[PDB]
Amino acid sequence: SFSGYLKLTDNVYIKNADIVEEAKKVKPTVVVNAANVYLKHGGGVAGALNKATNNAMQVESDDYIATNGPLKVGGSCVLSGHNLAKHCLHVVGPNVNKGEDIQLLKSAYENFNQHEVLLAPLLSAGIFGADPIHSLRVCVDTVRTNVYLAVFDKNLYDKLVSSFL
Numbered sequence: 001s002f003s004g005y006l007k008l009t010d011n012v013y014i015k016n017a018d019i020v021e022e023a024k025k026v027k028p029t030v031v032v033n034a035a036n037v038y039l040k041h042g043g044g045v046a047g048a049l050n051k052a053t054n055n056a057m058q059v060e061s062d063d064y065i066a067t068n069g070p071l072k073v074g075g076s077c078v079l080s081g082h083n084l085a086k087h088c089l090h091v092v093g094p095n096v097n098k099g100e101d102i103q104l105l106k107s108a109y110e111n112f113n114q115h116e117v118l119l120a121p122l123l124s125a126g127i128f129g130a131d132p133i134h135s136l137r138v139c140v141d142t143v144r145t146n147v148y149l150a151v152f153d154k155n156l157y158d159k160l161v162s163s164f165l
């Protein structure tokens with residue numbers, strides 16, 4: 001199972017780790033992708049997860065979008081986890097660099113409650129532009145299921161742990 005995580009709350013754990021390397025090691029039931037509405041996995045966590053699947057995630061995602069259309073900001077879909085996990089839960093947090101409503105971050109985290117355990121990044125953090133301290137706060141106050149957060153950046157991980165209320 002998950003190792004080396006710091007326990008933040010009854011159900012939220014955190015580790016300074018590359019979510020791709022973490023997924024390859026744990027092979028969790030669910031890995032969360034920091035997706036956009038088009039499932040265009042170009043950069044950030046999405047680009048990294050997709051590259052690890054040798055682009056199979058993007059091929060599957062394009063077929064999903066061709067059939068279903070785009071996701072909503074705050075929404076999700078369950079697709080294959082490929083070589084990384086049983087499933088990938090593609091969750092769209094608001095991208096504040098695209099002027100999206102930060103209030104939708106709670107709706108985005110609510111998707112995690114449909115899965116008993118997940119390996120996840122902080123939603124809307126990184127290239128999505130939100131404050132990761134705020135994202136962790138919304139995560140702990142919204143997610144009730146077991147969430148193992150992988151924070152790529154060591155300096156950000158230390159700031160998140162040291163400032164956690």
Ligand SMILES: NC(=O)c1cnc(C(F)(F)F)nc1
Nearest residue numbers: 018019020043044045048152
């Ligand atoms: N394995 C990678 O190449 C990798 C790159 N970038 C990231 C990011 F975006 F979370 F920081 N995580 C992993």
